[PDB]
Amino acid sequence: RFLKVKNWETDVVLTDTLHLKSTLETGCTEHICMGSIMLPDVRTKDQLFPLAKEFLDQYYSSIKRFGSKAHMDRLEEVNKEIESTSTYQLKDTELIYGAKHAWRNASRCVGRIQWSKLQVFDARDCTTAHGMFNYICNHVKYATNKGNLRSAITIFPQRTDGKHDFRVWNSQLIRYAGYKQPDGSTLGDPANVQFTEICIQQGWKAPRGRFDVLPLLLQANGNDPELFQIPPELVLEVPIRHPKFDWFKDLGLKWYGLPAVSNMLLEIGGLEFSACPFSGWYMGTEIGVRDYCDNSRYNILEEVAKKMDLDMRKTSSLWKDQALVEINIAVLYSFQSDKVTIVDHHSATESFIKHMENEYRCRGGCPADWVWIVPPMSGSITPVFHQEMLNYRLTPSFEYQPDPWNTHVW
Amino acid sequence: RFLKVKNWETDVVLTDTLHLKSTLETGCTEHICMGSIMLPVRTKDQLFPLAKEFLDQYYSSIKRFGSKAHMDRLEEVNKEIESTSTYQLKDTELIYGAKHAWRNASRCVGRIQWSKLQVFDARDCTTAHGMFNYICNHVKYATNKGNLRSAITIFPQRTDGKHDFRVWNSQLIRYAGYKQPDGSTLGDPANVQFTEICIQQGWKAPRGRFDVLPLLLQANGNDPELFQIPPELVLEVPIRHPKFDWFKDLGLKWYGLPAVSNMLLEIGGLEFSACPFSGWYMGTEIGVRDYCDNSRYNILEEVAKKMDLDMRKTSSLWKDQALVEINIAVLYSFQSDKVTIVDHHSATESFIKHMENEYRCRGGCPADWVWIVPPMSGSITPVFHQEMLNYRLTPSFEYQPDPWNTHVWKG
Numbered sequence: 049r050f051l052k053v054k055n056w057e058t059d060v061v062l063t064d065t066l067h068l069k070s071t072l073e074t075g076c077t078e079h080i081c082m083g084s085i086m087l088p089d090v091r092t093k094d095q096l097f098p099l100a101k102e103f104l105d106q107y108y109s110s111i112k113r114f115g116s117k118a119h120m121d122r123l124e125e126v127n128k129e130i131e132s133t134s135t136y137q138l139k140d141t142e143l144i145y146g147a148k149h150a151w152r153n154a155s156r157c158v159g160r161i162q163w164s165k166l167q168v169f170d171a172r173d174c175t176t177a178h179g180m181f182n183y184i185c186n187h188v189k190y191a192t193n194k195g196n197l198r199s200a201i202t203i204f205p206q207r208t209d210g211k212h213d214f215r216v217w218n219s220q221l222i223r224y225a226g227y228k229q230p231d232g233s234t235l236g237d238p239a240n241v242q243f244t245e246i247c248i249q250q251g252w253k254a255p256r257g258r259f260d261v262l263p264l265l266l267q268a269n270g271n272d273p274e275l276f277q278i279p280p281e282l283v284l285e286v287p288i289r290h291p292k293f294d295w296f297k298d299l300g301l302k303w304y305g306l307p308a309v310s311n312m313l314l315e316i317g318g319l320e321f322s323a324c325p326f327s328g329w330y331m332g333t334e335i336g337v338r339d340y341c342d343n344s345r346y347n348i349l350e351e352v353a354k355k356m357d358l359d360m361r362k363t364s365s366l367w368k369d370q371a372l373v374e375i376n377i378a379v380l381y382s383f384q385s386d387k388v389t390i391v392d393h394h395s396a397t398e399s400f401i402k403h404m405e406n407e408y409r410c411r412g413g414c415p416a417d418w419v420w421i422v423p424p425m426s427g428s429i430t431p432v433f434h435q436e437m438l439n440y441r442l443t444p445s446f447e448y449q450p451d452p453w454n455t456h457v458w
Numbered sequence: 459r460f461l462k463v464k465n466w467e468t469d470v471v472l473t474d475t476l477h478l479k480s481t482l483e484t485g486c487t488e489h490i491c492m493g494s495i496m497l498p499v500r501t502k503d504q505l506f507p508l509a510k511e512f513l514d515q516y517y518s519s520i521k522r523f524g525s526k527a528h529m530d531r532l533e534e535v536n537k538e539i540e541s542t543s544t545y546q547l548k549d550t551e552l553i554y555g556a557k558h559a560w561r562n563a564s565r566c567v568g569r570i571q572w573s574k575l576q577v578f579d580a581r582d583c584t585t586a587h588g589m590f591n592y593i594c595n596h597v598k599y600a601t602n603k604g605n606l607r608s609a610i611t612i613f614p615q616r617t618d619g620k621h622d623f624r625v626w627n628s629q630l631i632r633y634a635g636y637k638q639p640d641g642s643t644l645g646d647p648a649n650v651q652f653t654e655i656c657i658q659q660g661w662k663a664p665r666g667r668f669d670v671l672p673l674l675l676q677a678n679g680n681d682p683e684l685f686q687i688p689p690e691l692v693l694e695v696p697i698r699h700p701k702f703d704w705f706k707d708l709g710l711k712w713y714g715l716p717a718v719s720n721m722l723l724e725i726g727g728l729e730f731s732a733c734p735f736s737g738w739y740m741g742t743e744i745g746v747r748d749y750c751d752n753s754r755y756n757i758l759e760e761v762a763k764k765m766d767l768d769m770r771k772t773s774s775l776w777k778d779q780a781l782v783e784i785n786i787a788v789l790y791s792f793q794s795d796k797v798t799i800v801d802h803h804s805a806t807e808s809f810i811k812h813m814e815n816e817y818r819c820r821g822g823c824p825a826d827w828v829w830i831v832p833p834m835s836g837s838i839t840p841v842f843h844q845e846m847l848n849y850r851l852t853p854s855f856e857y858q859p860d861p862w863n864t865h866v867w868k869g
């Protein structure tokens with residue numbers, strides 16, 4: 049039960065002992081593997097104290113003060129505060145550590161070599177949706193940094209009794225609207241049709257274009273959410289052109305520079321932060337492969353292949369594959385030309401292998417979800433394809449949570 | 459207890475009850491998923507329940523469960539076990555078992571074909587020369603002048619584990635690999651260790667880049683013996699590109715018949731350690747893995763050079779561009795020579811239809827996403843978006859150690 053992982057391209061073998069510290073469950077059993085399943089009332093006083101203890105133990109071990117006066121003192125202080133208030137508050141030092149380690153533990157994230165360079169914005173003093181809007185504009189501007197992107201998270205007040213949740217209703221701070229057409233097709237991003245309508249069916253007036261930046265729908269302290277438009281000068285966008293095909297410009301494609309996931313839940317020492325938007329920078333395939341070429345998304349392969357004059361009669365001409373490469377060359381070329389941070393899938397997966405070897409050496413392992421880490425194109429020519437990975441759940445963590453409109457006591 | 463899988467591109471939801479008939483373990487637990495791990499002497503004691511379970515499944519499939527034929531067969535197998543410690547399958551049971559091992563192979567994307575399998579019964583074989591003869595006939599039948607036909611040849615089952623039949627080749631047709639004193643490799647690097655064994659056993663190696671390996675065959679636990687497959691039985695395809703005339707000058711070719719020969723077939727608790735099986739190629743097996751793996755022929759650089767791509771920064775995606783061209787060439791060459799092949803778009807779409815059909819008629823279809831998704835252009839194939847459940851059903855194909863690590867040499 050001191051497990052080994054092999055890289056089959058290089059024969060490097062790493063021994064994982066970190067998994068023995070895993071706490072939550074994977075969804076698999078000895079009889080069935082659920083590795084490809086996408087998604088496999090508050091804490092009571094009894095549940096919360098062990099969770100705090102485990103977190104504080106690892107925090108004080110990380111600062112080389114395990115079993116110290118200050119350590120035992122903090123355990124006592126939090127234990128007293130839980131007994132008293134039925135919750136507790138993290139010191140700023142513990143909050144920053146917990147957020148950095150939530151990212152470090154995110155087994156589906158290929159970008160984790162950067163995990164220790166996260167800018168943490170403490171927004172626990174926030175009380176209103178206007179205040180949330182202010183914190184998010186500041187996040188967006190800080191992270192965008194005129195195209196030299198910097199990783200950041202903004203942490204809003206923690207769940208109390210679940211009636212007073214802070215939530216960002218958008219799935220990302222910056223996404224494009226989706227409108228179902230009269231005839232039956234979809235204009236804009238189909239993934240956002242429901243949210244685009246909860247915006248319209250709540251106040252928003254839509255340009256009804258192909259790339260309309262959605263408004264923010266912000267919920268403070270459990271109240272009804274409020275619409276806010278992000279200042280357009282804070283939303284950095286990149287028009288997509290190709291370094292060889294002059295007609296690529298005519299396709300009319302753009303994308304935004306800042307990937308900022310806003311719908312997840314951050315868990316630190318048993319406390320729950322239901323509103324914790326975080327951002328980094330894009331790996332090129334997220335836009336070029338998934339956003340543009342998924343059939344349930346912008347689905348542009350047909351149109352691009354036609355402009356390339358490829359033989360689309362048979363699938364064995366690999367015209368889809370050929371167009372796919374060109375689309376992704378253009379995405380990287382456009383971001384690079386406009387000096388907006390982006391990473392290609394070869395560079396990012398190579399970095400993740402180096403990160404894995406760092407984590408195995410200095411931590412005893414690194415939880416990793418191969419199904420998500422392997423890029424959605426050219427899988428086996430990236431080094432992570434040949435890398436065995438162990439997947440398990442460590443805390444602090446980012447977790448999924450239900451969409452708030454299915455839950456909101458309106 | 460029922461289980462749901464969702465296709466996130468179509469929202470089709472399927473319900474799995476077949477996983478309840480799974481017995482063998484996956485390697486995973488509630489606390490760790492080993493879904494990407496490559497790899498995660500039997501007594502009369504455990505054998506009759508394994509036999510009974512198989513025979514119950516067999517007689518159910520033929521709508522004779524509980525019949526007198528069913529009960530007599532159980533009785534007969536039971537008494538054959540206690541008196542001889544093993545038993546023999548009827549021909550009907552062998553064919554059923556082999557087809558169902560393929561049906562149950564969760565890493566196989568080609569399973570829509572599972573019921574069209576030609577089963578060759580080689581259980582009367584006794585010598586390596588006899589094995590060579592059976593294998594040649596399999597190769598000729600399966601190749602069918604380029605119109606490939608799925609087939610499996612089944613040699614005698616394990617008895618005491620000291621008399622195993624084994625094919626020491628990992629596939630019936632493979633190219634040799636030679637390590638040079640300067641550290642480079644000539645031929646297929648995956649086959650260096652096996653090539654060295656063949657040479658040690660007396661094979662005269664041509665020492666070229668595409669030398670078909672000899673067969674190394676072990677009957678009845680004896681030392682293995684070398685045989686050369688008749689060259690006229692080995693169908694090969696020279697690789698050229700439909701637009702790039704310089705591509706032929708890379709000197710590439712491949713063989714048409716993929717025939718895996720190192721796995722173990724388990725049926726009713728019986729173990730067939732020599733059971734070579736063959737189908738036809740999915741293009742990416744050759745064009746992505748065999749040609750472009752860094753540890754294989756590794757032709758990306760020279761192809762990208764001749765294409766004159768920007769090779770100075772990986773963000774030109776020169777590797778991705780060359781990879782598509784190589785895979786176009788593989789498909790074009792096989793089709794032009796009229797040798798059966800399937801592209802990864804067709805094969806993944808067939809597998810989705812197969813999988814849905816299996817959920818309807820069978821209650822499930824065990825599938826290993828990590829292996830089913832093709833190694834290029836993953837998310838533009840429909841299997842990428844398909845949730846899958848992986849579990850172990852018998853009859854099954856299993857891995858077994860390479861024979862040279864376990865064989866006791868007679869000398």
Ligand code: HEM
Nearest residue numbers: 151154155156157158159162199326327328329330331446
């Ligand atoms: C800075 C560069 C980063 C890159 C290139 C990157 C890359 C990625 C990619 C490609 C995915 C798969 C996403 C998808 O397919 O939708 C992912 C998932 C994820 N990323 Fe990262 N990311 C970065 C930064 C961050 C940061 C700063 C955080 C949080 C502080 C984070 C947390 C996550 C999480 C939680 C997931 C899903 C993991 C899970 O459910 O286990 N990432 N990332």
Ligand code: HEM
Nearest residue numbers: 560563564565566567568571608735736737738739740855
């Ligand atoms: C007829 C066309 C077939 C195609 C296109 C096909 C395709 C494939 C592919 C692409 C793989 C992944 C292997 C790799 O990447 O190296 C695979 C695995 C496999 N195939 Fe098929 N195959 C076919 C027929 C067969 C037949 C006839 C059998 C046996 C009777 C078979 C049994 C298997 C098994 C046992 C595996 C490994 C599965 C596991 O460990 O669960 N296949 N196949």
Ligand SMILES: Cc1cc(N)nc2cc(-c3ccc(OCC4CCC4)c(CN)c3)ccc12
Nearest residue numbers: 086087156307308309326327328329330331
């Ligand atoms: C900071 C960051 C940077 C980046 N470049 N990319 C990122 C991608 C995600 C991400 C997006 C969508 C996801 O999928 C959600 C659906 C699957 C179930 C609901 C997940 C999965 N956790 C993660 C999160 C953060 C990212």
Ligand SMILES: Cc1cc(N)nc2cc(-c3ccc(OCC4CCC4)c(CN)c3)ccc12
Nearest residue numbers: 496497565716718735736737738739740857
């Ligand atoms: C009939 C057939 C046709 C085809 N087109 N392709 C086929 C591929 C395999 C196959 C190839 C390589 C494998 O990998 C070996 C590694 C696992 C341990 C070492 C496995 C393993 N399950 C199966 C087996 C049969 C195939």
Ligand SMILES: C[C@H](O)[C@H](O)[C@H]1CNc2nc(N)[nH]c(=O)c2N1
Nearest residue numbers: 084085086419420842843844845
């Ligand atoms: C069904 C399957 O789990 C689903 O398509 C997953 C596969 N791998 C993925 N990998 C990444 N990085 N992102 C995804 O959205 C998905 N989707």
Ligand SMILES: C[C@H](O)[C@H](O)[C@H]1CNc2nc(N)[nH]c(=O)c2N1
Nearest residue numbers: 433434435436494495496828829
């Ligand atoms: C580490 C990883 O499990 C290993 O590289 C697997 C990944 N998926 C694969 N899928 C197929 N079809 N064939 C393979 O050899 C592999 N190798």
Ligand SMILES: [Zn+2]
Nearest residue numbers: 076081486491
């Ligand atoms: Zn698993």
